[PDB]
Amino acid sequence: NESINPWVLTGFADAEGSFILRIRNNNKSSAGYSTELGFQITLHKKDKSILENIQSTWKVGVIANSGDNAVSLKVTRFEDLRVVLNHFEKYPLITQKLGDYLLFKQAFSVMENKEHLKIEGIKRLVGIKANLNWGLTDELKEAFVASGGENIFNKNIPNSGWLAGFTSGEGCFFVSLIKSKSKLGVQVQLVFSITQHARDRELMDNLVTYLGCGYIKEKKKSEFSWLEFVVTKFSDIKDKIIPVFQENNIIGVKLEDFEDWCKVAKLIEEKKHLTESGLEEIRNIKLNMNKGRV
DNA sequence: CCTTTCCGCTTATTCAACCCTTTACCC
DNA sequence: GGTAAAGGGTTGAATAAGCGGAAAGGG
Ligand SMILES: [Ca+2]
Ligand SMILES: [Ca+2]
Ligand SMILES: [Ca+2]
């Protein structure tokens, strides 16, 4: 039932997964607190099939709706988390997300030895939790810090499978219609982009060297910023990008976008993009891609 | 007989996707 | 001259991350 290649899956989890450690007030727990350790993926419902492919490839995880437009795969059963760990030991993450996995592995150790059933263990997990994802809430920071006391306190791209997973999460295949001082008054520019927060700047640099093309753009929106890896030089698209994903396939609905983008690349290589009829065929393809897909 | 697990649901922002202007390159 | 490539910029929602409530097997 191995619907998804394991490196593709590590790639897609580096893009979209999340490692969760909850420490909850519990009046009924001997220690005063209960714990939940989890791995999870939340996607738009149009990509349910990916989650079902993960779930059947791993044989763990519960699929459920998450709001009107999204679906989750959550793994919380403790012995099933051993499947998740074994996967990530064999096919390791490479983004900053690996730091969340490493903390996740440490909590798991605590919990395996049952120490989380004692206030000692809970405090160990609070320390683990403080650097994991968004850290401790105020209620929890406050419950475990006293007046006068102290406060609670990157790998290379392995292969194209990992890059196919990751792109299926964060990639964009875009046809750009540029107003131009050319005969037709429009230039067709193919754009491949991968977008990521600058905490992963070094991954972005590795994309340029791994693929042999492209460049990084610094993007800004008020107080928030991020990066894009971008490729538009047509010979690199044709000779580096397209063939890579033709061998190592994009998963989900994005596959249909990559198939359309490739159809435009064909028109471009035949020069039909410099014709009025070739142009209107590109327009029709573009409008039913991405946001415009029905 | 406490503790694990599931379930429905919510929130902030890092993503994806989008467009326009300028410069570089080469039958 | 005419096309390709790169520079320069935006937006809204699909992600990430994680809440509260409760089912259920268990002395
Ligand atoms: Ca991501
Ligand atoms: Ca995505
Ligand atoms: Ca994403």
How would you write chain A as a 3-class SS string? Answer: CCCCCHHHHHHHHHHHEEEEEEEEECCCCCCCEEEEEEEEEEEEHHHHHHHHHHHHHHCCCEEEEECCCEEEEEECCCCCHHHHHHHHHHCCCCCCHHHHHHHHHHHHHHHHCCHHHCHHHHHHHHHHHHCCCCCCCHHHHHHCCCCCCCCCCCCCCCCHHHHHHHHHHHEEEEEEEEECCCCCCEEEEEEEEEEECHHHHHHHHHHHHHHCCCEEEEEEECCEEEEEEEECCHHHHHHHHHHHHHHCCCCCCHHHHHHHHHHHHHHHHCCHHHCHHHHHHHHHHHHCCHHHCC
Q: Do domains A1-141 and A153-294 have the same CATH topology?
A: yes
Is the CB of residue A43 less than 8 Å from the CB of residue A35? no
Fold assignment, A153-294: Endonuclease I-creI (3.10.28)
Amino acid at A35: T
Q: Are A188 and A283 contacting, i.e. CB atoms less than 8 angstroms apart?
A: no
Give the sheet arrangement for strand A17-25, strand by strand: A17-25, A33-44, A70-75, A62-66
Q: Is the separation of the CB atoms in A90 and A6 below 8 Å?
A: yes
Smallest Cα–C1' distance to nucleotide C5: which residue has it?
A233
Considering only residues 29-88 of chain A, list those whose CB is below 7 Å from strand C: 40, 42-44, 47, 66-67, 69-70, 72
Ligand 3 centroid to residue A232 C-alpha, Å: 21
Strand A224-231 with A33-44, pairing: unpaired
Per the structure, the residue whose CA is closest to nucleotide C6 at C1' is A232
Q: Which residues of A are annotated as a binding site for Ca(2+)?
A: 15-16, 169-170
Among the listed residues A114, A108, A113, the one whose alpha carbon sits nearest the alpha carbon of residue A30: A114
CB-based contacts of A64: which residues, under 8 Å, 6+ apart? A71, A72, A74
Resolution expressed in Å: 2.2
Residue with tokens 């290589």: A269
How is chain A split into domains, by residue range?
1-141, 153-294
Per the CB < 8 A criterion, the answer to whether A174 and A191 are in contact is yes
Q: List strand B contacts in A 188-247 (CB < 7 A).
A: 189, 191, 193, 195-197, 200, 219, 221, 224, 226, 228
Distance CA A125, CA A69 (A): 33
The whole-number Å distance from A164's CA to B23's C1' is 33
CA-CA distances (angstroms) from residue A170 to A13, A156, A229, A273? 11, 17, 11, 28
Q: Which nucleotide is nearest to A29 (CA to C1')?
A: B2
CATH architecture entry for A1-141: Roll (3.10)
Strands A186-196 and A70-75, bridge-based pairing: unpaired
- Residue whose token pair is 């030089």: A233
Method by which this entry was solved: X-ray
